[PDB]
Design a protein around this ligand. Sequence first.
Ligand code: FAD
Ligand code: FAD
Ligand code: PAB
Ligand code: PAB
Lengths: 394, 394
Amino acid sequence: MKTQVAIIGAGPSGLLLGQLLHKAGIDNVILERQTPDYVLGRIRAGVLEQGMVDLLREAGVDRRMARDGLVHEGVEIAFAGQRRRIDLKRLSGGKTVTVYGQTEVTRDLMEAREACGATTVYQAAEVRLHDLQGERPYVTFERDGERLRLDCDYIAGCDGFHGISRQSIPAERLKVFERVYPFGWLGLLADTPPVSHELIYANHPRGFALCSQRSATRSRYYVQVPLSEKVEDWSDERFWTELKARLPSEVAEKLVTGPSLEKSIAPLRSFVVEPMQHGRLFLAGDAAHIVPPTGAKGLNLAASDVSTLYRLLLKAYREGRGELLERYSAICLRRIWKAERFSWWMTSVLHRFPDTDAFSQRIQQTELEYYLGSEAGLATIAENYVGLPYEEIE
Amino acid sequence: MKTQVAIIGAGPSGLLLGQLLHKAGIDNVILERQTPDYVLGRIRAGVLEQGMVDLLREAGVDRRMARDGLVHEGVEIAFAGQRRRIDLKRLSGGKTVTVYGQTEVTRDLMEAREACGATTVYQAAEVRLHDLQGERPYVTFERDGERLRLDCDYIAGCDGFHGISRQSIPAERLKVFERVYPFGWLGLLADTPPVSHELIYANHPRGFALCSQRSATRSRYYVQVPLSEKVEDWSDERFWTELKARLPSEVAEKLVTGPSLEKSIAPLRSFVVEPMQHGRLFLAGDAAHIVPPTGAKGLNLAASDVSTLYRLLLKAYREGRGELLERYSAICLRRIWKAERFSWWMTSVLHRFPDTDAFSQRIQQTELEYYLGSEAGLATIAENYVGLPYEEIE
Ligand SMILES: Cc1cc2nc3c(=O)[nH]c(=O)nc-3n(C[C@H](O)[C@H](O)[C@H](O)COP(=O)(O)OP(=O)(O)OC[C@H]3O[C@@H](n4cnc5c(N)ncnc54)[C@H](O)[C@@H]3O)c2cc1C
Ligand SMILES: Cc1cc2nc3c(=O)[nH]c(=O)nc-3n(C[C@H](O)[C@H](O)[C@H](O)COP(=O)(O)OP(=O)(O)OC[C@H]3O[C@@H](n4cnc5c(N)ncnc54)[C@H](O)[C@@H]3O)c2cc1C
Ligand SMILES: Nc1ccc(C(=O)O)cc1
Ligand SMILES: Nc1ccc(C(=O)O)cc1
């Protein structure tokens, strides 16, 4: 069995890359461990940068998004009994973000891939990568008891944080940068109208809270929660009471509550690996880096890694410029670090940390007052929030 | 012995307040523990904000400054083998800073006070404050063996971090916010031409370094140094070698070295006390708060506390509005916290911290790249650097 580019993982990264590649004539095969249904079960992301919206358009999978997605020109930050609105559109010079669930984006790519007839092997068990440094690498896997081999020119590891691809690179060749935060996010999806037309990030003494949405009849809420927490400990009612206690009274009053459709806890982490490639293996998305959800950069960084990889692969196949692929890591890392820096900053000013001294609490409160009250402070948040420009390569 | 306002401390704070008060008809007496010579021995500050330059003018003690002071429109930040210039004037909308030694400013105020004939008691031993909550507070001290009493309406504690005034307020009434940094600054004053026409703040793997100046023939340099350091351990030559090792090669090459006129080590600290007053006692300057030198806000915050106190005292004496004095702390604290926040930020991105993990070193490097490469980042540094606007009161 042979292809040009083998893609490990059918999450948004692998599907986007596969679609981009297909449209340009580069055959690719996606291998996924789970079932299409399991993949569609992950709620995750809700906020997309302008640049990701454009990439979706370029992959020609933007019909439903253009119809159902909500474009946002602002976002709110509540702290110490006051809400402050940041005009993204004004402050960033016209850019906005789009709220469209990750579940939907993934569904759209999956349908688009099916219609084109491109190869996708679900339940590909025991994926193993071989000859990463040879001129002919290959992937082996098992589909219903029998071991198959897939030959390729390149492998794009788009298998998330627990994928096999990063594990296939000699550990000595990698440099890991990581920070674990002493808390997680308890998220709740409900078939209720969101409490606001724009997102509200809230710093409250009891901990962080965030009011988000998926559509006009579907809401997504989060509350900062300690690591020791178990989801079965949080009834829908306890969640609503907790969420209401962290929000400004005039917002908590108009909140329409309801039974949860999904409830989960996600720990916050920062992770970056350098470089992001080895021989003919290139890492992309969560396989290469994790950012805490606070800045909504995860899925967005994956899109840029993918945009970069695709353009380099085109150059390599169509233009015979195979040497340009060595620049992959240098290029992605620049955007990754600025995004990690932004997510880190958002996380530190919005959450309540354990055993914080009086001085640090005061400095935290002051960062908010400063950045939210200065025209220049506002602009730093906004341009970062809508997403910094992709580099064009060459 | 009686006056209207008793002033404890003849450093820049006490002298500026005394001068302002005198020019408006409000009698005041300054009490200082040391001799005029000891006071003039402190080198300290070199950078003044626009607002402090204007206050000096308002006190009519700006002749020598207008002649000898150097106005700066930019400042440089060197890191990872690259110098980046921040155009203060452009980015802040025209403001600049003035380099004029604290020793000179103090000399100018002292001469101005002497010429006007205002009272100043040097070597006032054992100053004690009494009846802080009565309608008639008083200060007692000793001048050559005999105990004297000074009656007043108000007392302005301008006695620095180790003064008696903050110690005279019931400790239970105060809330202290403080952070100690694990390093200090080793500074060297030399009668040599500065290596650059503008200041250069340098983040280097070996630690922080700063190239400053006092005039065209007098330089002031600093290097980050561990707490365990003793000044006698640092020969002039060791200092020059160390300073040269932390600077970019093209800057270290043109450095004119020479014998030190003064050499000292100052530990870095952040300290804020809330409130800044008690009854008829009002704290100002270093008596109320300390900021690490990195942002050059110390003397500048003292000026704003003083500007605020003087205007409130005028209202009280001339206009019979004694109740406005209760607003002193609320007003000064707003500016103090933003300045503490700025100094804290400058300190964290420019210095090398002990036992720093790979992630934090990377985030530090990235803060520099971000703020120094974005038009909005630059503007946040600049407007903070030149100094945020004073509030007008009322
Ligand atoms: C609470 C939460 C909120 C977030 N909010 C946002 C937001 O609003 N905006 C934003 O930009 N980001 C956000 N993100 C991040 C975003 O969800 C991720 O960055 C994104 O899912 C990365 O996609 P991916 O394709 O790289 O990885 P994944 O989504 O993990 O998919 C990887 C795929 O590879 C598969 N796989 C794993 N191992 C193997 C193997 N051995 N063989 C074959 N297949 C394998 C996995 O099954 C999976 O299907 C959030 C994340 C969380 C959890
Ligand atoms: C390394 C260094 C660099 C700095 N660089 C800058 C910079 O460039 N820009 C900037 O804005 N700031 C800077 N500063 C800070 C600035 O020096 C101080 O904030 C400033 O000196 C505050 O003045 P002050 O009058 O409040 O206090 P002080 O200068 O301390 O004077 C207080 C006076 O009160 C006197 N006194 C003390 N106790 C008593 C008592 N019991 N009775 C009577 N008198 C008493 C003291 O003798 C002293 O004379 C720097 C500080 C340092 C050390
Ligand atoms: N920053 C974030 C904003 C929104 C969401 C979400 O809607 O799921 C997640 C993270
Ligand atoms: N930030 C600072 C800048 C300059 C000086 C100084 O010249 O003495 C001190 C601190």
